[PDB]
Design a protein around this nucleic acid. Structure first.
Ligand code: 118
Ligand code: 118
Ligand code: 118
Ligand code: 118
Ligand SMILES: [Zn+2]
Ligand SMILES: [Zn+2]
Lengths: 275, 275
DNA sequence: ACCCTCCCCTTAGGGGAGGGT
DNA sequence: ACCCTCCCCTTAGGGGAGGGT
């Protein structure tokens, strides 16, 4: 006849008093006997074995609440249980692994923004392909455009990436605009990350890309009086070197800070493909 | 000038009112203006952009609490952040993957208990190798043995597997015992699962195995009056067919139910290797 | 129809006091 | 020394009422 003080138990089955104390109250693991005089908790050498399954269970991560009926069942039962437990583990797994990738996609995209060497002048390079989706921007000028203008397409991205548009886009025609009001938005995208089956795409959105062609682009930080010049100087550029234009302009925007705390600024990126 | 009702916001950035309502209270995302007459919440088309990072952040799984200083930083900052976030994801990952395996080890071991075809008689087969650890059972007889007798070795297993001893063992000498008191425990193990570096092993425990040799074993459900016969009949067996003994007996125990609710019973497994 | 608030639920405990063996 | 209790903390909200536009 071996009987134990709660201490002993907690020392024996590495456990916190408060833990077991509340396991008693959880009714999962009550002591073999409470001294109705001193409210003290005493357990029997028997009991301990019960502590295994819970340790286990809690290890895996199953609410004590479930651990409740968890005990009751016998082997062929618990076995299936334990497997159900694996379909679970085996689930969250590949879920996150995704993110893992997902981010590693984002990051790269991020760094490639900082890696811009010429802030303010034309950059001309070899770019990669852009899985993106847009709608046709019915009327909206760079002066019109909002965010509420994004809803749908947004609702969509997150619905197939979990991750929202960090990047914001719209395309527009290539012309020697006199003014800003001289240009009105064509299509307005969002960059897609996942290569998963984007389905349920309501036909109002098209699903395509920015090819892996040549680009003559330039970046900066938006400023009204700014934006324009930069576009101007873009125009000049091609017009000068005379290169052959092959798409529209991809002025794409991304914020630099996300702080409510202050004045929102962001980096801009008008780019044009050419051959 | 576009201004929105909380509804709109919740409809626009797929979000729950209560969510944002509490984001305001969290002070993360407060409205652009609260009607000091009607306490109504109004946001600006500006704001929304702020909602991205949080959606994102909450997506990844970062307490809003952290999301707090999360915003404030600028790119080269947030970028590193986002990576720290990946060391995290990239962490929990391989952690669980482990379990995944760990269990798939257990399960198999489990099923191999149900797959016992002859409950009550001798089974003779080709077995696999057993990474296990034990101590030398100083005196303890099958009559002595407890659980408190396990502590250490137990403390250890969980400390290197997360998972506790589902299986319980002890070895003992091979002899034609007259009685139960005629046998006293030699070594008393616990089966090790992980193939990881079990270190800090205080020299009081040895780390070895049950080989992949031949076994003449039998199982059942313990019962005092029982246990004995079964051992007896084991003895008989070898003595009869005359096979050559090569180790000690591995009577190993495992419970069948873990329910506090009732009378604890368990399946037993005296096994002997022979050539 | 929308919004706003106040309230009371939802895990698994942990720290810390406050008195008693 | 140990135990026991009572209490008040710890996320991210969600349902539901209760009255007001
Ligand atoms: C000899 C053996 C056990 C008890 Sb106890 C007990 C009493 C006071 C303080 C600690 C332990 C006991 C149990 C029920 C009724 C009266 C006394 C006792 C026995 C087994 C398990 C736990 C406690 C007393 C004498
Ligand atoms: C009218 C319409 C949109 C913008 Sb703006 C903007 C707003 C604040 C600070 C900086 C820029 C904008 C317009 C053209 C090109 C780049 C930015 C704007 C951007 C995203 C979402 C909503 C408005 C500006 C005036
Ligand atoms: C024209 C444009 C805006 C407001 Sb309003 C407002 C008032 C009552 C109910 C809903 C909106 C406003 C704001 C501050 C002080 C007085 C009136 C308002 C404007 C921009 C953003 C949010 C609300 C009023 C008239
Ligand atoms: C004295 C010492 C240990 C056991 Sb038992 C045991 C206890 C209750 C119900 C069934 C068995 C036991 C002894 C020899 C072989 C198999 C089981 C026993 C088992 C594990 C831990 C503590 C005691 C029995 C009497
Ligand atoms: Zn078009
Ligand atoms: Zn020895």
């Amino acid at each position: 006849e071996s009987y134990y003080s709660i201490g002993e138990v907690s020392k024996l089955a590495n456990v916190s008093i408060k833990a077991l104390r509340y396991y008693d109250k959880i009714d999962l693991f009550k002591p073999a006997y409470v001294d109705p005089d001193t409210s003290y908790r005493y357990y029997t050498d028997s009991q301990l074995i019960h502590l295994d399954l819970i340790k286990s269970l809690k290890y895996i991560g199953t609410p004590l609440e479930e651990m409740k009926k968890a005990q009751d069942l016998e082997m062929e039962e618990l076995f299936a249980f334990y497997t159900e437990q694996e379909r679970q583990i085996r689930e969250k797994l590949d879920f996150l692994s995704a993110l893992e990738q997902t981010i590693s996609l984002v990051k790269k995209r991020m760094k490639r923004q900082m890696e811009y060497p010429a802030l303010g002048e034309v950059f001309v390079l070899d770019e990669e392909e852009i899985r993106i989706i847009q709608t046709e921007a019915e009327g909206i000028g760079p002066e019109n455009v909002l965010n509420a203008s994004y809803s749908k397409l947004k609702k969509f991205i997150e619905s197939a990436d979990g991750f929202t548009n960090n990047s914001y886009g719209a395309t527009f025609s290539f012309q020697p605009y006199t003014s800003i009001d001289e240009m009105t938005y064509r299509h307005i995208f969002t960059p897609v990350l996942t290569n998963k089956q984007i389905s349920s795409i309501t036909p109002d959105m098209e699903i395509t890309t920015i090819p892996k062609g040549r680009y003559a682009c330039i970046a900066y930080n938006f400023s009204p009086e700014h934006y324009f010049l930069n576009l101007q100087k873009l125009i000049k550029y091609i017009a000068d070197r005379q290169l052959t234009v092959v798409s529209d302009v991809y002025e794409l925007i991304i914020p630099i800070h996300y702080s409510p705390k202050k004045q929102e600024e962001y980096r801009v990126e008008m780019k044009i493909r050419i051959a």
